[model samples]
Target: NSASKNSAISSSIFCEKYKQTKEQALTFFQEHPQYMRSKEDEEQLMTEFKKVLLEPGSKNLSIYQTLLAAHERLQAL
Candidate 1:
């Protein structure tokens, strides 16, 4: 999981640093549907992602960071 997060964060931050608009992010995710595993997995994952984004200081910071990294990477496409 940590390894996944590290790679994901690297890519996500790279995309954001280069200014990937939200629309582009959405489109990227749409193009890479398999990245989310399945519809159910995507929904649940996004829900958790939102919760973490809304409160990054939560006790589950490590898990949240991993999920955030994944969410961001998917959006980055």
Candidate 2:
């Protein structure tokens, strides 16, 4: 906005770019055909996610733990 010019709008600003404002990091397609990743890709992802560290130096299990659980649960089907 032109209102942001004139040497006074360059301070802390309003809001930082929260969660990738330029593009949709998480996208949903309505009425689109759905398919899971290929077996090879899925297996690779499983291996990669299995090595992820969700939390450290705390007594909390991060949500990504559950996220990986559901992946295996669905992969069985």
Candidate 3:
């Protein structure tokens, strides 16, 4: 359940930071699918990427940061 839990947490944080509701975020992705990587599920990718923005914590900030860093690197593509 950690994966699911993290996705939920990340989604909430991302939506809040970006001024989006879950619905709006999904819509944004749909309208701009180019932001997502191939082979990733639309909503799931959005949720996973959002975890990168979570602040440091005992749970898994470092792990999420690594993920975020990888995503950032992808921007050169």
Q: Number of the top candidate by lDDT? A: 1
- At residue 24, what lDDT does model 1 achieve? 55
lDDT of 2 by residue, 1-77 (tens): 67557334543242243432222212321211132435665565456445443334222433344334434555565
Measured against the true structure, the TM-scores of the candidates, in listed sequence, are 0.34, 0.27, 0.28
Ten-residue stretch with the least lDDT total in model 1:
58-67
User: Model 3, 1-77: lDDT tens per residue?
Assistant: 79999998887786666544555545555655655766565454455556545535424444334444534545544
CA lDDT of every candidate: 0.62, 0.39, 0.54
lDDT winner between candidates 1 and 2: 1
TM-score winner between candidates 1 and 2 = 1
Model 1: C-alpha RMSD to truth? 11.8
Find the number of clashing residue pairs for candidate 3: 0
lDDT of 1 by residue, 1-77 (tens): 79899988876875567544455556656765664778876886677566666765654444434465657655675
Off by over 4 Å in 2: 1-35, 53-77
Cα distance off (Å), candidate 1, residue 42? 0.2
